[PDB]
Amino acid sequence: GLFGAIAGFIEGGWTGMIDGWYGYHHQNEQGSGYAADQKSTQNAINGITNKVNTVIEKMNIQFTAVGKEFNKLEKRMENLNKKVDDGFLDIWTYNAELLVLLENERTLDFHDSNVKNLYEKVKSQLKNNAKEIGNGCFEFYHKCDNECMESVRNGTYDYPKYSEESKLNRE
Amino acid sequence: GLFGAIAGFIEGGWTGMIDGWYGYHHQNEQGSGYAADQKSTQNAINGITNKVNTVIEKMNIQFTAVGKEFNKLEKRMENLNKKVDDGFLDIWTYNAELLVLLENERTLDFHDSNVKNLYEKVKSQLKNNAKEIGNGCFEFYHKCDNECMESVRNGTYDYPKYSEESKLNRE
Amino acid sequence: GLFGAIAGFIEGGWTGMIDGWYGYHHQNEQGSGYAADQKSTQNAINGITNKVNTVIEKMNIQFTAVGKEFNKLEKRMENLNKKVDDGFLDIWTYNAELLVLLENERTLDFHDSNVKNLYEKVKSQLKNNAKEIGNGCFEFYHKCDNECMESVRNGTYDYPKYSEESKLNRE
Amino acid sequence: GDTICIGYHANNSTDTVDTVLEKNVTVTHSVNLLEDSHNGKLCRLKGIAPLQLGKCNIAGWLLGNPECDPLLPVRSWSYIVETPNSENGICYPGDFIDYEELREQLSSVSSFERFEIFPKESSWPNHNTNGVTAACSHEGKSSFYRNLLWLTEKEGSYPKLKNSYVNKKGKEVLVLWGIHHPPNSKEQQNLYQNENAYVSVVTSNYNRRFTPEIAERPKVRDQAGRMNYYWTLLKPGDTIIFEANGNLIAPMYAFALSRGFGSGIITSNASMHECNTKCQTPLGAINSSLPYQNIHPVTIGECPKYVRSAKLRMVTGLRNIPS
Amino acid sequence: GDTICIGYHANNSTDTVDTVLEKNVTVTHSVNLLEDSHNGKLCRLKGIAPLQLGKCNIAGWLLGNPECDPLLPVRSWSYIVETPNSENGICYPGDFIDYEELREQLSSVSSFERFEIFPKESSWPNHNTNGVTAACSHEGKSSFYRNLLWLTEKEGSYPKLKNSYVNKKGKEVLVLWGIHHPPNSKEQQNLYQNENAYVSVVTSNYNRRFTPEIAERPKVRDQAGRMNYYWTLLKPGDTIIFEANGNLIAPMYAFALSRGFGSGIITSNASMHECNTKCQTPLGAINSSLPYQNIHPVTIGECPKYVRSAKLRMVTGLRNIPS
Amino acid sequence: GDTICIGYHANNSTDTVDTVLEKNVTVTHSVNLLEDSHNGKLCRLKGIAPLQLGKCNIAGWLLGNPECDPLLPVRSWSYIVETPNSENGICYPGDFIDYEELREQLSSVSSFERFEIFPKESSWPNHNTNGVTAACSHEGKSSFYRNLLWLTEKEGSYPKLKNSYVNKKGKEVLVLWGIHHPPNSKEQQNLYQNENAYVSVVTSNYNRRFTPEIAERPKVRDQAGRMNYYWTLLKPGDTIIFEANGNLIAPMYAFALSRGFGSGIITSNASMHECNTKCQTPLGAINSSLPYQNIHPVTIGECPKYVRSAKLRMVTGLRNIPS
Ligand SMILES: *[C@@H]1O[C@H](CO)[C@@H](O[C@@H]2O[C@H](CO)[C@@H](O[C@@H]3O[C@H](CO)[C@@H](O)[C@H](O)[C@@H]3O)[C@H](O)[C@H]2NC(C)=O)[C@H](O)[C@H]1NC(C)=O
Ligand SMILES: *[C@@H]1O[C@H](CO)[C@@H](O[C@@H]2O[C@H](CO)[C@@H](O[C@@H]3O[C@H](CO)[C@@H](O)[C@H](O)[C@@H]3O)[C@H](O)[C@H]2NC(C)=O)[C@H](O)[C@H]1NC(C)=O
Ligand SMILES: *[C@@H]1O[C@H](CO)[C@@H](O[C@@H]2O[C@H](CO)[C@@H](O[C@@H]3O[C@H](CO)[C@@H](O)[C@H](O)[C@@H]3O)[C@H](O)[C@H]2NC(C)=O)[C@H](O)[C@H]1NC(C)=O
Ligand SMILES: CN(C)CC1CN([S@@](=O)(F)=Nc2cc(Cl)c(C(=O)N3CCO[C@@H](c4ccccc4)C3)c(Cl)c2)C1
Ligand SMILES: CN(C)CC1CN([S@@](=O)(F)=Nc2cc(Cl)c(C(=O)N3CCO[C@@H](c4ccccc4)C3)c(Cl)c2)C1
Ligand SMILES: CN(C)CC1CN([S@@](=O)(F)=Nc2cc(Cl)c(C(=O)N3CCO[C@@H](c4ccccc4)C3)c(Cl)c2)C1
Ligand SMILES: *[C@@H]1O[C@H](CO)[C@@H](O[C@@H]2O[C@H](CO)[C@@H](O)[C@H](O)[C@H]2NC(C)=O)[C@H](O)[C@H]1NC(C)=O
Ligand SMILES: *[C@@H]1O[C@H](CO)[C@@H](O[C@@H]2O[C@H](CO)[C@@H](O)[C@H](O)[C@H]2NC(C)=O)[C@H](O)[C@H]1NC(C)=O
Ligand SMILES: *[C@@H]1O[C@H](CO)[C@@H](O[C@@H]2O[C@H](CO)[C@@H](O)[C@H](O)[C@H]2NC(C)=O)[C@H](O)[C@H]1NC(C)=O
Ligand SMILES: *[C@@H]1O[C@H](CO)[C@@H](O[C@@H]2O[C@H](CO)[C@@H](O)[C@H](O)[C@H]2NC(C)=O)[C@H](O)[C@H]1NC(C)=O
Ligand SMILES: *[C@@H]1O[C@H](CO)[C@@H](O[C@@H]2O[C@H](CO)[C@@H](O)[C@H](O)[C@H]2NC(C)=O)[C@H](O)[C@H]1NC(C)=O
Ligand SMILES: *[C@@H]1O[C@H](CO)[C@@H](O[C@@H]2O[C@H](CO)[C@@H](O)[C@H](O)[C@H]2NC(C)=O)[C@H](O)[C@H]1NC(C)=O
């Protein structure tokens, strides 16, 4: 994708993560598990829901549109009516197909952006208390229990608390 | 935003910075102050001015367009004329609303991109002579006077000049 | 550009690199040379080829469209026909110009994204076995022969193999 | 050591969309915007049943061709249904003047009252009213339009007749009448007694004089003669006057018209069911809030916009990579 | 230690825009593209004042209904203004043939010269020219169109008349005339003396013969008779010939037409002021370089494109976060 | 120490495109979508040569004005070419009824057979067939339409004539005829002997009676008289009957019509060459798979969409920075 996260440095998705589009997988002494990031997920749902509603909202209700009839001496008017009908149909078909292709491109890019932003947000919180090990994973230089894991997940990670232990481990 | 800078890792704007869209706030021994980045600001103004002018330029002048009249035995032609008028109005309204929504999205994303690019440009200039302290701020490991501050602001920062002092301070 | 790589931190293009849009220039004991990245280049060609074909595909063949004639007592119908013809022409001209401008913007941004992603992919492979020296260049802290250069170029670089020598050189 | 990873959702979804850069992209979640499904039935529109002309077309219905099942004296509808094999139309050959304009008028009509404008046994004294023709046959016997009356000579005389009706219905009244053009001068004398006959029709906003044209025409439905059909809408409060000394096919029944919005004429092979819809097409009713449809360009009511597209699916979720 | 921060502008701006992903986004800077403001006045267009028909409509103006303030003999305009209550129209009841086509013709007319094509006291010898009617009353007295002349029998005879005018104006000349249809044969003899009268009109590219139709019509403006109105555009250098032996409402005044671009007919309740605009609507003049407007679909001159949108505001600045 | 750099392609390309943010951007690779190139020739369309009317227009061709080079008795075409200086049109002055509708009909015609519907020396006994006029001159001598016949009195009598043709061609047959309107009553008697002449024409779906109008008209091509021209399409199996006692310009040749798709009438100053195209314009043929063109809005065949754009170039490569 445009931001290099989805089908990029993070090769694959998690079927194990069923509660949101984006989130975290952790492994520590206490065990392992997945948890969706509710904030980034909910924001994304609101945006995409607004985008879908906007597309539907712009196409106004169609009111009664029916054929007209013309006698053998009104061939020009018949062809004019057909020209008008065909012209409008050509335009709406063009508009519909192009809008969906563009919004689809923008949507996939939007998800890619959201995933990269979540990774960088985690990266900047952890700083040098962990190492980047590829595939969007961090390996801690200190012991990180479920409380520690929750502090990263909910954006309140305490760098100084583990800075000494991490420094010792990093050597 | 799409690039995670505006309303992202940089939470808020500066009402104090009145001379451009993007720029710098500094604090050193000599004092503190704001200064807009003229290069990135002017480039952005030119782009957005081109974008606005392009949108206006594409809508050609409307020339005289008035109602027509039809007698009691030309009801089909009257409805055809109405169909044409309503059809064109539906299309232009659709086109106008969609163009403005898309360009608005692209504009907000463009500003977000410009801000992130300015941060990364500063980051890459300073290297390890300063630490990232969040909220788009750097804290120097050396003394940085107004001359030093100007060299970063105008893109001529001299890493080797302060590399020893920074190394000593970083320990 | 939107991603800050092209005409950004990488100031200029390489006329020397004739086999792809993106790739590598290396300098080691054995000599120097350019090589295009075939994977990122081919993917980009497929995308852009799909984009061009999509634009052409959406404009359906025009079938016979010719003038009509009206006598001195059908002036309204003549003006209606002209209104229809002018209306459709206004719309298609608007649609064509806007589609090309938007796709052009998206295309330049797409290339910028592809270049930045290739740089970050190299950056994350090398880690601290090399230093970022600006202008999209890395300077190795170890000896890197043509085999080493190929491993980075084809994405199989072996960090541990040179980690000791690099550490020694970095001091 | 302990690890934490950032990642994204995948599932067993097989839905695909297209983008500008790429075709056939598998995504976790998406929404169809293109309605393709209808029930294949004719339904009521917003409570009101349609008017089914059955074996008749508009011409057959309004003239009252005997072959078509007589509709109630008062009816209302949301739209009008003709069938493709509308064989019972005009039964006596000739031209229907401004037929297409009359159809366009009827397309904004919401109801009618069929009423006796000129009672048969009173309206046309000293004239014959029993005139029938094999071109308009019913139950094997020669017959005639239920809404018109063939006036002919009586006891060898056709006295000049003059009749008017005053529109006290408080709605537009559609009046229909005919002008007969015998193939030769001997039939003209036999039927109307007067070689130089005329017909005149007059209202506040209508005036036309009709003169018969005698000539040997090709046989159509075994008739060398012709019948031209004319109509007008008599405004509320206005008077219509018929003056004739021959060749007049007199109005007998007329229609008090009510105007509606969102009506129209469609052709359909579909059958009426006890169902209700907001959107009717000639193939079937649509029950959808989707913005687009590829079912039919002909729509009655509040419908999605018709497009030629085979697929319109918007991605909402992510590129699906469950590997 | 010393610090440097990267940041972005904020201010006290309350302007909002919509995007695809989000509604009601507050931004530091933006531009309105949708013009909603007009001055509520009729103005000149590019220097030229409009033609105000006042109490008349096009039919009333060109026939010269006596109720309408006589306009100058020579006029020019940028557009034509009728009012919604155009009560003074056709004053003597009947049909105006190709009225809508004539309006369409006038929509590309930039000026006229009103001139005496057939001087009253010379043009029609041995005929009465004093004919007036209560249907076209002026100052309580029976009167007639200022541009037409009611020719009737004189001393019990209506001699066949034949007159032609040669167009030496070097511009198209619009000629108007009428055909009277008495309600009965006794009026016909009284007025024109000849039961079998005809009228013919001929030019290089126009030929039509008119025959009166006698019949008792419903009273309209207290008249059972009818008057049909006809027109043609006589090409520069061409000749028009009128031949009649009765029932002819003769042309008296005609119009030398100049063609313009960008003219049209509008209906407006607004009043003329001493102002000038590039863009006029029926509600008022627009003074704007903005590409769109939601004021009115009817435009004269060089106007923004009409759209139904309530708001069209483009963001130029940034998401405003002054917190 | 050893180095590796990431970079992007540059070359000597000078191609420029526009974007939303920026104009005149130099790029390494791009594609033109706007076709501006034609060969300036008239060519065949999908194998079939066009019908070149040359000195004639549609009116001149179908009536058979003597000035126009007689075309083969059987022809087929992909489109129809008139020239701007079509001076040879209607040669005897009058009106061509429903000319524009007839052109619209011909626009869906793919071929014709010119055949003798009414042989000159057999079709009209006891009438003169030698009538010619200086208005339709050929080789300096007075002549007449090749497809019509001027019937006039013979030996001081014009007997009532009645003729019919039965359409056994298995295609629509276009029949043309005329009605002559002498300027005065003395010419009428001289030419047709009967002051009160009529003409009637009848088919299964056509009926019209024609009466001459005598009046002194302005001289056109030195003629004060007029000739009106009428046409009908006789359906396969149907019969056309002409009945007249004067003033009839009889059909002599008619056209068996074949229907095609994708035909039309264009005006062109260009010359026919031995070339073949899928797309023809009045300026020249287009040989292009490009989606857009700015050459001409008039197109025959399978053409790019016409637009007003001066340039439509899509970038494929990168911003070109060879510095
Ligand atoms: C759009 O993408 C989908 C997803 O890849 C395509 O569906 C897939 O179609 C291929 C057809 O070659 C399937 O391959 C076959 O699989 C069977 C076993 O399932 C194997 O025995 C055959 O030898 C063959 O390789 C593939 O399974 C299938 N994938 C899924 C998930 O259904 C689809 O064809 C693409 N459409 C277009 C128009 O490109
Ligand atoms: C679009 O966004 C703007 C900005 O937030 C909205 O304006 C705001 O509207 C709310 C209405 O609930 C205002 O709240 C109220 O403030 C007063 C004091 O000013 C307080 O006493 C009330 O209890 C109430 O909370 C809010 O002040 C106001 N903000 C500004 C800057 O004017 C606007 O409503 C949004 N529009 C839509 C359609 O969502
Ligand atoms: C679009 O961009 C191109 C590329 O810059 C413009 O082409 C260039 O046009 C300028 C005109 O001022 C050329 O400058 C001149 O160069 C000659 C020597 O070649 C020098 O003697 C003159 O004093 C002058 O400076 C420039 O060479 C030329 N560049 C190239 C590569 O051809 C073009 O004008 C731009 N178009 C628009 C409409 O802005
Ligand atoms: C006019 N109406 C009837 C048309 C409908 C279409 N819209 S709607 O406005 F609901 N469009 C949609 C918007 C969204 Cl975010 C989604 C979507 O993609 N959803 C539903 C929310 O939860 C998401 C989710 C994420 C992660 C794990 C499981 C589920 C998946 C879907 Cl599947 C449809 C209204
Ligand atoms: C046809 N014409 C009359 C319509 C007008 C609209 N255009 S125009 O092409 F000027 N559009 C605009 C373009 C821009 Cl960059 C801006 C804008 O946003 N501006 C003005 C430049 O300075 C910016 C700024 C930045 C930072 C601190 C203070 C001020 C703020 C604005 Cl507010 C409008 C022409
Ligand atoms: C309907 N048809 C006839 C119209 C044509 C236009 N299309 S097409 O679908 F081929 N469009 C194009 C697509 C692409 Cl990727 C390119 C392009 O930009 N190309 C060609 C591939 O190689 C690229 C390249 C990269 C690096 C060094 C040298 C060359 C440069 C070009 Cl130059 C055109 C079909
Ligand atoms: C994020 O998670 C951490 C860890 O749970 C929260 O810190 C607190 O941790 C102690 C455990 O010693 C709990 O008793 C508290 O309940 C936690 N605080 C709260 C507010 O729940 C931290 O507060 C969490 N932050 C947010 C925003 O939820
Ligand atoms: C960027 O700012 C620095 C600091 O002012 C400039 O360096 C020079 O600094 C000395 C102070 O000892 C001044 O006397 C010079 O005037 C400065 N140079 C210039 C060109 O002004 C540096 O040059 C600046 N760079 C740019 C591009 O403006
Ligand atoms: C990427 O390049 C490296 C270096 O050539 C490949 O590693 C192997 O290197 C040895 C040299 O000692 C060669 O003999 C092998 O042929 C190389 N392997 C292969 C598969 O060619 C590495 O394999 C390359 N990877 C890819 C995906 O091409
Ligand atoms: C028309 O479509 C609507 C919307 O799907 C149908 O309403 C649903 O009916 C089913 C079963 O009766 C319910 O389980 C759904 O919950 C209903 N959906 C909503 C949104 O109300 C409706 O039945 C369809 N038919 C008609 C005649 O309206
Ligand atoms: C029409 O609008 C223009 C543009 O706003 C008006 O011109 C301005 O007038 C005011 C006061 O007279 C000046 O302060 C502005 O500087 C003018 N702007 C420009 C761009 O020239 C104009 O007065 C308006 N009215 C008319 C009749 O043109
Ligand atoms: C029409 O255009 C096509 C496409 O360019 C022409 O075909 C090419 O002809 C040249 C020389 O004859 C060849 O070198 C190219 O390889 C051909 N291109 C393709 C795609 O086949 C064609 O000659 C043109 N003229 C006609 C009459 O078709």
Give the separation between CA D222 and CA E112, rounded to whole angstroms: 59
Q: Which residues pair with E44 in a beta bridge?
A: E276
Q: Which residues pair with E25 in a beta bridge?
A: E17
Give the separation between CA D265 and CA D300, rounded to whole angstroms: 9
Relative to beta strand F199-202, strand F207-210 is antiparallel
Q: Which residue of E has its CA nearest to B116?
A: E6
The ligand whose atoms approach the alpha carbon of C155 most closely is 9
Give the separation between CA B85 and CA B110, rounded to whole angstroms: 37
Which amino acid is present at D274?
E
Cα-to-chain-centroid distance, residue A128: 28
Residues for chain C: how many in total?
171
- Min Cα distance A82 → chain E (Å) is 24
Phi and psi, residue F201, nearest 5°: -135, 135
Q: Which residue of A has its CA nearest to C117?
A: A4
Sign of CA dihedral D77, D80, D81, D87: positive
Which method was it determined by? X-ray
Q: Does the CB atom of residue F24 touch ligand 3 within 6 A?
A: yes
Q: Which residues pair with A131 in a beta bridge?
A: A139
Q: Of ligand 4's atoms, which has the minimum distance to the CA of residue A21?
A: 26
Give the separation between CA F261 and CA F301, rounded to whole angstroms: 10
Say if CB D12 and CB D294 are below 8 A apart. Answer: no
Give the separation between CA F158 and CA F128, rounded to whole angstroms: 9
- Min Cα distance C51 → chain D (Å) is 5
Q: Which residues pair with F306 in a beta bridge?
A: F293
Phi and psi, residue E32, nearest 5°: -80, 130
Give the separation between CA F98 and CA F322, rounded to whole angstroms: 67
Resolution in A: 3.1
Q: Can you state the percent helix, strand and coil of chain F, rounding each to 5? A: 10, 40, 50
C-alpha E277 to ligand 11 mean position (Å): 12
C-alpha D310 to ligand 10 mean position (Å): 25
Residues 6+ apart with CB under 8 A from B38: B19, B20
Cβ–Cβ of B124/C9 closer than 8 Å?
Answer: yes
The residue among A39, A58, A64 with the most chain D CBs within 10 A of its CB, best to mutate, is A64
Q: Which residues pair with D314 in a beta bridge?
A: D31
Q: Which residues pair with A138 in a beta bridge?
A: A132, D4
Tokens of E133: 């009617």
- How many angstroms separate the Cα of F146 from the Cα of each of F68, F82, F119, F143? 10, 20, 12, 9
E strand segments, E16-150: 16-17, 25-26, 30-32, 34-35, 42-45, 51-52, 74-76, 80-82, 109-116, 133-138, 141-143, 148-150
- Contact of A128 with chain B, judged by CB distance below 8 Å, is answered with no
* CA triple D151-D153-D159, angle to 5 deg: 95
Interface of E with C in 159-218 (CB under 8 A): 205
Cβ–Cβ of C73/E205 closer than 8 Å?
Answer: no
Say if CB E114 and CB E85 are below 8 A apart. Answer: no
- Contact of F310 with chain B, judged by CB distance below 8 Å, is answered with no
Q: Does the CB atom of residue B59 touch ligand 5 within 6 A?
A: no
Give the separation between CA E235 and CA B25, rounded to whole angstroms: 80
The protein residue with its alpha carbon nearest to ligand 8, atom 22, reads B151
- Say which residue the tokens 């994304």 belong to: A44
Identify the burial level of F199 via C-beta atoms within 10 angstroms of its C-beta, where 0-12 means exposed, 13-18 middle and 19 or more buried: buried
The protein residue with its alpha carbon nearest to ligand 4, atom 24, reads A20
> With the CA atoms of D19, D22, D27 and D29 taken in that order, what torsion angle do they form, in degrees rounded to the nearest 10?
0
Residues of chain D positioned with their CB less than 8 A from the CB of C48: 21
Tokens of A27: 């492994």
Say if CB B42 and CB E273 are below 8 A apart. Answer: no
Supply the DSSP symbol for D70.
P
Give the separation between CA D99 and CA F4, rounded to whole angstroms: 83
Chains touching chain C, criterion 3+ CB pairs below 8 Å:
A, B, D, E, F
> With the CA atoms of E182, E188, E194 and E198 taken in that order, what torsion angle do they form, in degrees rounded to the nearest 10?
-10
* CA triple D128-D130-D135, angle to 5 deg: 125
Cα-to-chain-centroid distance, residue C66: 42
Q: Which residues pair with F300 in a beta bridge?
A: F280
Q: What is the CA radius of gyration of chain F?
A: 29
Say if CB F245 and CB F194 are below 8 A apart. Answer: yes
The residue among C76, C79, C86, C93 with the most chain E CBs within 10 A of its CB, best to mutate, is C76
Tokens of B127: 């290297």
C-alpha A97 to ligand 10 mean position (Å): 28
Residues for chain A: how many in total?
171
Residues 6+ apart with CB under 8 A from E104: B68, C75, C76, C79
Q: How many CB pairs under 8 A join A and C?
A: 43
Say if CB E200 and CB E243 are below 8 A apart. Answer: yes
Say if CB C61 and CB F41 are below 8 A apart. Answer: no
The separation between the first and the last C-alpha atoms of chain B, rounded to the nearest angstrom, is 37
The separation between the first and the last C-alpha atoms of chain D, rounded to the nearest angstrom, is 26
Ligand 5, from E15, E27, E29: best to mutate by most atoms within 8 Å of Cβ?
Answer: E29
Tokens of E220: 């309209």
Phi and psi, residue F224, nearest 5°: -90, -20
List, in order of start, the domains of chain F with CATH numbers. Answer: 1-37+288-323 (2.10.77.10), 44-267 (3.90.209.20)
Say if CB C117 and CB A8 are below 8 A apart. Answer: yes
C-alpha C109 to ligand 4 mean position (Å): 29
How many C-beta neighbours within 10 Å does residue E30 have?
Answer: 21
- Say which residue the tokens 């080079």 belong to: F69
Give the separation between CA F25 and CA F7, rounded to whole angstroms: 19
Q: Does the CB atom of residue B20 touch ligand 5 within 6 A?
A: yes
Chains touching chain A, criterion 3+ CB pairs below 8 Å:
B, C, D, E, F
Identify the burial level of F185 via C-beta atoms within 10 angstroms of its C-beta, where 0-12 means exposed, 13-18 middle and 19 or more buried: exposed
The residue among F20, F180, F217, F226 with the most chain E CBs within 10 A of its CB, best to mutate, is F217
Give the separation between CA A145 and CA A168, rounded to whole angstroms: 18
How many C-beta neighbours within 10 Å does residue D215 have?
Answer: 21
C-alpha D302 to ligand 3 mean position (Å): 58
| Helix (H), strand (E) at residue D259 | strand D253-259
Question: Contacts by D302-305 with C-beta closer than 8 Å and gap 24+?
Answer: D302/A61, D302/A62, D302/A63, D302/D278, D303/A61, D303/A62, D303/A63, D303/D278, D303/D279, D304/A59, D304/A62, D304/D35, D304/D279, D305/A59, D305/A62, D305/A92, D305/A96
The separation between the first and the last C-alpha atoms of chain A, rounded to the nearest angstrom, is 37
Residues 6+ apart with CB under 8 A from E262: B63, B64, E45, E78, E300, E301
Tokens of D149: 């009356």
Q: Does the CB atom of residue C156 touch ligand 9 within 6 A?
A: yes
- How many angstroms separate the Cα of B86 from the Cα of each of B91, E238, F176? 9, 42, 41
Half-sphere exposure of F285 toward its Cβ, with a 13 Å CA cutoff? Answer: 20
Tokens of C147: 């085999």
C-alpha E38 to ligand 11 mean position (Å): 14
Cβ–Cβ of A75/F104 closer than 8 Å?
Answer: yes
Say if CB C141 and CB C130 are below 8 A apart. Answer: yes
C-alpha E315 to ligand 5 mean position (Å): 10
C-alpha E35 to ligand 11 mean position (Å): 15
Residues 6+ apart with CB under 8 A from B46: none
Q: Which residue of A has its CA nearest to E24?
A: A50
Give the separation between CA D305 and CA B80, rounded to whole angstroms: 18
The ligand whose atoms approach the alpha carbon of E26 most closely is 2
Q: Which residue of B has its CA nearest to A111?
A: B2
Give the separation between CA C94 and CA C82, rounded to whole angstroms: 18
Chain B positions with Cβ closer than 8 Å to F: 47-48, 50-51, 54, 103, 106, 110
The ligand whose atoms approach the alpha carbon of E25 most closely is 2
Residues 6+ apart with CB under 8 A from E167: E173, E234, E235, E236, E237, E238, E239, E240
Cα-to-chain-centroid distance, residue B124: 21
Residue A45, SS3 per DSSP: helix
Residue A100, SS3 per DSSP: helix
- Min Cα distance B4 → chain A (Å) is 6
**For the domain bounded by B1-171, which CATH number is listed?**
3.90.20.10
| Helix (H), strand (E) at residue F104 | helix F99-106
- How many angstroms separate the Cα of D86 from the Cα of each of C148, D137, D230, D281? 84, 16, 21, 19
Cβ–Cβ of B66/E266 closer than 8 Å?
Answer: yes
Cβ–Cβ of D23/C110 closer than 8 Å?
Answer: no
Q: Does the CB atom of residue E24 touch ligand 2 within 6 A?
A: yes
Relative to beta strand D265-267, strand D80-82 is parallel
Chains touching chain E, criterion 3+ CB pairs below 8 Å:
A, B, C, D, F
